Design an enzyme around this catalytic site. Structure first.
Site, PDB file in Angstrom:
ATOM      1  N   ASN A 123       0.544  -1.043  -0.034  1.00 58.23           N
ATOM      2  CA  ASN A 123       0.240   0.123  -0.393  1.00 58.23           C
ATOM      3  C   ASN A 123       0.662   1.264  -0.481  1.00 58.23           C
ATOM      4  OD1 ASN A 123      -2.380  -1.694  -0.351  1.00 58.23           O
ATOM      5  ND2 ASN A 123      -2.526  -1.250   2.280  1.00 58.23           N
ATOM      6  N   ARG A 125      -9.853  -1.987  -6.924  1.00 59.48           N
ATOM      7  CA  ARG A 125     -10.121  -0.217  -6.341  1.00 59.48           C
ATOM      8  C   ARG A 125      -9.559   0.407  -6.177  1.00 59.48           C
ATOM      9  NH1 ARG A 125     -14.546  -1.385  -4.259  1.00 59.48           N
ATOM     10  NH2 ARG A 125     -15.635   0.829  -3.901  1.00 59.48           N
ATOM     11  N   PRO A 160     -17.928   3.407  -0.261  1.00 57.07           N
ATOM     12  CA  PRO A 160     -17.845   4.513  -1.671  1.00 57.07           C
ATOM     13  C   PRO A 160     -16.955   5.587  -0.853  1.00 57.07           C
ATOM     14  CG  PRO A 160     -18.920   5.308   0.383  1.00 57.07           C
ATOM     15  CD  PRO A 160     -18.905   3.546   0.329  1.00 57.07           C
ATOM     16  N   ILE A 161     -16.591   6.796  -2.065  1.00 59.18           N
ATOM     17  CA  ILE A 161     -15.500   6.912  -2.418  1.00 59.18           C
ATOM     18  C   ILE A 161     -15.442   8.066  -1.993  1.00 59.18           C
ATOM     19  CG2 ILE A 161     -14.040   5.779  -3.993  1.00 59.18           C
ATOM     20  CD1 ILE A 161     -14.607   7.222  -6.325  1.00 59.18           C
ATOM     21  N   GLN A 172     -16.200  10.847   0.043  1.00 58.05           N
ATOM     22  CA  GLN A 172     -14.775  11.641   0.246  1.00 58.05           C
ATOM     23  C   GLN A 172     -13.766  12.379  -1.154  1.00 58.05           C
ATOM     24  OE1 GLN A 172     -16.374  12.749   3.107  1.00 58.05           O
ATOM     25  NE2 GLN A 172     -14.215  13.282   3.362  1.00 58.05           N
ATOM     26  N   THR A 188      -9.943   8.962   5.800  1.00 53.42           N
ATOM     27  CA  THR A 188      -9.613   8.112   4.697  1.00 53.42           C
ATOM     28  C   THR A 188      -8.403   7.946   3.918  1.00 53.42           C
ATOM     29  OG1 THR A 188     -10.121   7.899   2.696  1.00 53.42           O
ATOM     30  CG2 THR A 188     -10.410  10.089   2.895  1.00 53.42           C
ATOM     31  N   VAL A 189      -7.721   6.622   3.983  1.00 49.47           N
ATOM     32  CA  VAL A 189      -6.389   6.265   3.278  1.00 49.47           C
ATOM     33  C   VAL A 189      -6.285   6.566   2.092  1.00 49.47           C
ATOM     34  CG1 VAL A 189      -4.897   5.092   3.290  1.00 49.47           C
ATOM     35  CG2 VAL A 189      -5.744   4.353   5.447  1.00 49.47           C
ATOM     36  N   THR A 190      -7.177   6.416   1.403  1.00 54.54           N
ATOM     37  CA  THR A 190      -6.380   6.780  -0.389  1.00 54.54           C
ATOM     38  C   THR A 190      -6.981   7.936  -0.824  1.00 54.54           C
ATOM     39  OG1 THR A 190      -8.787   5.800  -1.098  1.00 54.54           O
ATOM     40  CG2 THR A 190      -6.084   4.396  -1.602  1.00 54.54           C
ATOM     41  N   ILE A 245     -13.469   1.001  11.132  1.00 55.21           N
ATOM     42  CA  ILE A 245     -12.782   0.951   9.799  1.00 55.21           C
ATOM     43  C   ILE A 245     -13.952   0.425   9.102  1.00 55.21           C
ATOM     44  CG2 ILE A 245     -11.061   1.498   8.832  1.00 55.21           C
ATOM     45  CD1 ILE A 245     -11.020   3.358  11.039  1.00 55.21           C
ATOM     46  N   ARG A 288      -2.437 -11.486  -3.720  1.00 56.63           N
ATOM     47  CA  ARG A 288      -3.030  -9.655  -4.102  1.00 56.63           C
ATOM     48  C   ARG A 288      -2.101  -9.261  -2.666  1.00 56.63           C
ATOM     49  NH1 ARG A 288      -8.615  -7.987  -4.525  1.00 56.63           N
ATOM     50  NH2 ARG A 288      -7.703  -5.733  -4.850  1.00 56.63           N
TER      51      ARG A 288
HETATM   52  C1  LIG Z   1      -7.783  -3.686   2.178  1.00 58.12           C
HETATM   53  C2  LIG Z   1      -6.929  -3.097   1.711  1.00 58.12           C
HETATM   54  O1  LIG Z   1      -6.355  -2.003   2.924  1.00 58.12           O
HETATM   55  C3  LIG Z   1      -6.826  -0.720   2.708  1.00 58.12           C
HETATM   56  C4  LIG Z   1      -7.247  -0.598   4.169  1.00 58.12           C
HETATM   57  O2  LIG Z   1      -8.002  -1.995   4.850  1.00 58.12           O
HETATM   58  C5  LIG Z   1      -8.071   0.884   4.092  1.00 58.12           C
HETATM   59  C6  LIG Z   1      -7.871   1.087   5.856  1.00 58.12           C
HETATM   60  O3  LIG Z   1      -6.383   0.757   6.483  1.00 58.12           O
HETATM   61  O4  LIG Z   1      -6.778   1.992   3.810  1.00 58.12           O
HETATM   62  C7  LIG Z   1      -7.179   1.887   2.077  1.00 58.12           C
HETATM   63  O5  LIG Z   1      -7.919   1.500   1.956  1.00 58.12           O
HETATM   64  P1  LIG Z   1      -8.899   2.734   1.680  1.00 58.12           P
HETATM   65  O6  LIG Z   1      -8.404   3.377   1.994  1.00 58.12           O
HETATM   66  O7  LIG Z   1     -10.351   2.572   0.698  1.00 58.12           O
HETATM   67  O8  LIG Z   1      -9.521   2.781   3.486  1.00 58.12           O
HETATM   68  P2  LIG Z   1     -10.452   3.975   4.030  1.00 58.12           P
HETATM   69  O9  LIG Z   1     -10.348   5.324   2.820  1.00 58.12           O
HETATM   70  O10 LIG Z   1      -9.419   4.819   4.898  1.00 58.12           O
HETATM   71  O11 LIG Z   1     -12.173   3.991   4.296  1.00 58.12           O
HETATM   72  C8  LIG Z   1     -11.791   3.691   5.723  1.00 58.12           C
HETATM   73  C9  LIG Z   1     -13.875   3.946   5.975  1.00 58.12           C
HETATM   74  O12 LIG Z   1     -14.066   4.991   5.184  1.00 58.12           O
HETATM   75  C10 LIG Z   1     -15.031   5.182   4.058  1.00 58.12           C
HETATM   76  N1  LIG Z   1     -14.934   5.890   3.534  1.00 58.12           N
HETATM   77  C11 LIG Z   1     -13.765   6.177   3.000  1.00 58.12           C
HETATM   78  C12 LIG Z   1     -13.345   7.243   1.865  1.00 58.12           C
HETATM   79  C13 LIG Z   1     -14.677   7.425   1.882  1.00 58.12           C
HETATM   80  O13 LIG Z   1     -14.752   8.512   0.356  1.00 58.12           O
HETATM   81  N2  LIG Z   1     -15.784   7.485   1.870  1.00 58.12           N
HETATM   82  C14 LIG Z   1     -16.032   6.088   3.247  1.00 58.12           C
HETATM   83  O14 LIG Z   1     -17.462   6.527   3.551  1.00 58.12           O
HETATM   84  C15 LIG Z   1     -15.030   3.311   4.272  1.00 58.12           C
HETATM   85  O15 LIG Z   1     -16.304   3.095   3.665  1.00 58.12           O
HETATM   86  C16 LIG Z   1     -14.578   2.726   5.124  1.00 58.12           C
HETATM   87  O16 LIG Z   1     -15.384   2.353   5.914  1.00 58.12           O
HETATM   88  C17 LIG Z   1      -6.126   0.671   2.110  1.00 58.12           C
HETATM   89  N3  LIG Z   1      -6.286   0.307   1.005  1.00 58.12           N
HETATM   90  C18 LIG Z   1      -4.497   1.267  -0.092  1.00 58.12           C
HETATM   91  C19 LIG Z   1      -4.767   0.463  -1.057  1.00 58.12           C
HETATM   92  O17 LIG Z   1      -3.929   1.504   0.501  1.00 58.12           O
HETATM   93  C20 LIG Z   1      -5.675  -3.442   0.641  1.00 58.12           C
HETATM   94  O18 LIG Z   1      -4.496  -3.480   0.177  1.00 58.12           O
HETATM   95  O19 LIG Z   1      -7.064  -3.389  -0.660  1.00 58.12           O
END
Ligand SMILES: C=C(O[C@H]1[C@H](O)[C@@H](CO)O[C@H](OP(=O)(O)OP(=O)(O)OC[C@H]2O[C@@H](n3ccc(=O)[nH]c3=O)[C@H](O)[C@@H]2O)[C@@H]1NC(C)=O)C(=O)O
Length: 416
Positions: free
Chosen positions: A24, A92, A122-123, A125, A162-164, A325, A395
């Site tokens: 990641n 995604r 959802p994205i 954010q 949100t991380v990504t 989370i 993966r």
């Molecule tokens: C699952 C993976 O790792 C994940 C890891 O579990 C999570 C949490 O730490 O942060 C990354 O996903 P992510 O960015 O989508 O996680 P987050 O965006 O922080 O989502 C956290 C929570 O916020 C919610 N969320 C997030 C963005 C948004 O626009 N709206 C929203 O409601 C999500 O539904 C979730 O319940 C990692 N993926 C990558 C590529 O960095 C993976 O390896 O694919």
């Protein structure tokens, strides 16, 4: 493919294991190359499906690259700004191409992610940030069409961490020749690693609390970078050592990215001793229940939740594991129950009543990170455990079965 693992339990994990680069961290860093026309070199990149799919996308976007000896050599000759639905449905996180493409062309067409087994995810954010950035955003044909009339400073606060989302915003802002501000950002080590890369490229980024001050540039340079180690893989093997009552020495890991994990591991009965940079892990006391709540970094990782649930399934007492989370992420709980565990799930909280032993059987992988919990359980379950659809594990982990085998696990992969 339908490859699967056959794990014959009953062996303590012992020996050394070299931790791979962070999947990641590599993903956002690779997408960052889109921001420059100059050659970039990224080392310590793990050879696993997500990385390969990212490289495929970059090639589709026009880049020329090679992946050898865990090193990505790329000539970011991007000549397209369309990230197709197929790639998005396969990973995604490909949405991370949005920020860079917009910063480079002022336009982007990225497939909108569908649901995921981990949750709807959802994205909103991500899209909200780009709208706040002044971009025109429209969803048509299942694609998100983003058009930017002109780059301007941005001041945006995430409604949730949100991380990504944070990464996508940083990727775009790094291309804006003005001073912008992000509030309530994610502090995950991977985000910090991406930040160093953006600075190496020429952008200015200051992190204070959960605020990020950015000063971008329209002439970003190429870079050379070695990604941080994968803390999730490291934590997974640590759990493995304690669960199997073995003794392992993790090489190339970072204790400073594992505080919350080490803390809980010790409460359960494990021990972690640092030797230079290496981490020696073993079981010090009999296993005991402990409560765990997932949180954004530096808190306990949701990506480590399933693994600890497997460890706690055979600990003395009732443990409470709450997800803050990914509240839906508990598929593994019932698979563990198929092994004789006694786990209940009520809303976003799981309760684990420790049992004396587990009994091997067939279980199905469904989560690239969480399903490692099934492999872990298989290491101690009586008899043999068959882990189906390891494609998911391919993966999220680099040479997982090979590293386990090297540690004494009686595991084998059946190609199908
Ligand atoms: C699952 C993976 O790792 C994940 C890891 O579990 C999570 C949490 O730490 O942060 C990354 O996903 P992510 O960015 O989508 O996680 P987050 O965006 O922080 O989502 C956290 C929570 O916020 C919610 N969320 C997030 C963005 C948004 O626009 N709206 C929203 O409601 C999500 O539904 C979730 O319940 C990692 N993926 C990558 C590529 O960095 C993976 O390896 O694919």
């Amino acid at each position: 493919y339908r490859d699967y693992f056959v794990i014959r339990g009953g062996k303590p994990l012992t020996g050394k294991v070299k931790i791979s680069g962070a999947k990641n961290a590599a993903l956002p860093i690779m997408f960052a190359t889109i921001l420059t026309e100059e050659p970039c070199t990224i080392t310590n990149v793990p050879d696993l499906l997500d990385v390969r799919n990212t490289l495929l996308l970059l090639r589709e976007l026009g880049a020329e690259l090679e992946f050898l000896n865990n090193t990505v050599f790329i000539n970011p000759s991007i000549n397209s700004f369309i990230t197709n639905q197929e790639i998005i449905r396969r990973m995604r996180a490909s949405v991370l191409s949005l920020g860079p493409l917009l910063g480079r062309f002022g336009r982007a067409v990225v497939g909108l992610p569908g649901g995921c087994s981990i949750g709807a995810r959802p994205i909103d954010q991500h899209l909200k940030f780009f709208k706040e950035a002044g971009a025109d955003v429209e969803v048509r044909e299942g694609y998100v069409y983003v058009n930017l009339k002109e780059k301007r400073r941005v001041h945006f606060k995430f409604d949730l961490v949100t991380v990504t989302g944070t990464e996508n915003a940083l990727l775009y802002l790094a291309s804006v020749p003005e001073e912008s501000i992000l509030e309530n950002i994610a502090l995950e080590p991977e985000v910090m690693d991406l930040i160093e890369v953006l600075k190496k490229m020429g952008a200015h980024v200051k992190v204070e609390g959960r605020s990020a001050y950015v000063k971008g540039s329209e002439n970003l340079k190429g870079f050379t970078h070695s990604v941080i180690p994968d803390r999730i893989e490291a934590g997974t093997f640590m759990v493995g050592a304690v669960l199997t009552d073995g003794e392992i020495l993790l090489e190339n890991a970072r204790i400073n990215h594992l505080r919350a994990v080490v803390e809980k591991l010790k409460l359960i009965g494990g021990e972690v001793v640092e030797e230079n940079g290496n981490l020696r892990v073993f079981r010090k006391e009999s296993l005991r229940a402990c409560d765990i709540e997932t949180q954004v970094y530096p808190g306990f990782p949701t990506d480590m939740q399933a693994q600890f649930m497997a460890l706690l399934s055979v600990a003395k007492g009732k443990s409470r594991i709450k997800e803050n989370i990914f509240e839906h992420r508990f598929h593994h709980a019932q698979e563990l129950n198929r092994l004789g565990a006694n786990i209940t799930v009520r809303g976003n909280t799981a309760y684990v009543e420790g049992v004396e032993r587990l009994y091997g059987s067939e279980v199905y992988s469904t989560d690239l990170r969480a399903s490692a919990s099934l492999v872990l359980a298989g290491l101690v379950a009586q008899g043999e455990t068959v882990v189906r659809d390891v494609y998911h594990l391919d993966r999220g982990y680099e040479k997982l079965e090979e590293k386990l085998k090297k540690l004494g696990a009686d595991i084998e992969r059946v190609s199908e």
